[PDB]
Each structure stands twice: as structure tokens, then as C-alpha cells.
Structure 1
Amino acid sequence: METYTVKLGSDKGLLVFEPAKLTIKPGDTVEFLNNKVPPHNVVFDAALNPAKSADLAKSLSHKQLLMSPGQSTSTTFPADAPAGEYTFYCEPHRGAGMVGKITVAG
């Protein structure tokens, strides 16, 4: 089981997730770390995950904006997380491009 870190706001101050795509296994953890240019959150899309399950997406999301410097949240993917793409975005910055994608694979 592995932990992968995704910066919220790149080191260069861009409104992106750094990195914006990652491939992981079920059971792995993605740590989302408040980095630059607040405020950010992490909302998984309800339809764009392999089960098209709003409940799966809710379970992986952190809807609350991260309001402290270097605040961390993490999503440990279920053991039974289905293979495929999981689209997520930052709500405030969605229209600025702050969108990401996790692929779950074996």
C-alpha cells in the first residue's frame, strides 16, 4: 500500500493539482496537501468514476475548503475500488482549470 501526495496549488503558484494525474492501486492513499494560492477543496465527480456512483465519489471527497496553511487531507481508496478513471476537481478553481484524474489499476 502506497501513499501519493498531490499538492493543492503547484509550487509555482498555478491553480492546479500537482501532479494532476496519478495511477494507483485500490487500497492506496492520496494525500491532498494545501500548498499555494487558496482556497482549495477536493471533490470527486459523481458520474465520472467507474461505478458512476455518487456515494463512492462522496466517500473519496473533501468538500470543506482547506483553510490552514499546509493543511492535509487524505483519501484512502477502498480495497474494492473499481478499476478506472476518477475525475476530481477543486470547486473554487474548477473554472480556472483545477481538475485532476486518478486512475485505479492493478
Structure 2
Amino acid sequence: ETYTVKLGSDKGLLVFEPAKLTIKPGDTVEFLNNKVPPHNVVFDAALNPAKSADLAKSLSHKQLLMSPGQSTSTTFPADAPAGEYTFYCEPHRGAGMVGKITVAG
């Protein structure tokens, strides 16, 4: 299944919309640049079920998305470990642009 997370709400808030999502291993999350760019998508190296920096890096998109309508996607590994994956937008982290994906069966 492919799910869409907007970067910046339609109201213009510095949030992911939605900010929490439950998926299965192998699902894709599309991150769509929506409002108040630039944004990026960085998975936390410690706050994933494997506490694996490499895993987090593989899921992340560090380059800034500059224009509304740009997108990037993360397809989770087929054997992604179950549990919680915290991610954030680097420029807007301090303003609260933090999200969480939960992988479950």
C-alpha cells in the first residue's frame, strides 16, 4: 500500500499531515511537498526498532524539497522491524515538525 504524508498542512502549519501512520513492512510512504517549504525527511538514528543508524539513513531524504508539488518516497524494507520510527524535518524540527511511523503486521 502507498500512503501519502503532506509536508506542511493545507492551513500552512509546520507539521506532517498526518503526523502518525501505521504501515506494514513493504509499504511505501510518499512525502509530498505541500506548503511552507523547504522541508526534508530525516529518520532518527536511535528512535527506530533496531537502533540502527544505517536503517534510518536508508529511509531518509536529506535534500530539501524546495517547491510545492515535489515528492520523495520511502518504501520500507520487506523485513522492516516492527515498532516505531521517529522522523522529522530538519529546518522545522524545533517548531514541532516531527512524525512517527509504526510498522506492524
TM-score > 0.5, shorter chain as reference: yes
What is aligned with 1:55? 54
Once the two structures are superposed, what CA deviation does each residue of 1:6-31 show, in whole Å capped at 9, x if it has no partner?
A: 00001110000000000000000000
What is aligned with 1:91? 90
CA distance in 2, matches of 1:79, 1:66: 26
Measured on the aligned residues, the alpha-carbon RMSD in Å equals: 0.4
Can you give the 5+ residue segments of structure 2 that lack an aligned partner in the other structure?
none
Shift of 1:76: 0.1
Once the two structures are superposed, what CA deviation does each residue of 1:11-60 show, in whole Å capped at 9, x if it has no partner?
A: 11000000000000000000000000011000000000000000000000
CA distance in 2, matches of 1:55, 1:28: 19
Shift of 1:103: 0.1
CA distance in 1, matches of 2:4, 2:49: 22
Shift of 1:90: 0.1
Shift of 1:67: 1.5
Q: Secondary structure at the match of 1:56?
A: helix
Do residues 22 (structure 1) and 28 (structure 2) align?
no
CA distance in 1, matches of 2:68, 2:33: 6
Q: Secondary structure at the match of 1:58?
A: helix
Shift of 1:68: 2.4
TM-score for the superposition, normalised by structure 2 = 0.99
Q: Secondary structure at the match of 2:3?
A: strand
TM-score for the superposition, normalised by structure 1 = 0.98
- Aligned residue pairs: how many? 105
Shift of 1:69: 2.2
Answer with 87-96 or 62-71: which moved more: 62-71
CA distance in 1, matches of 2:55, 2:96: 23
CA distance in 1, matches of 2:39, 2:66: 8
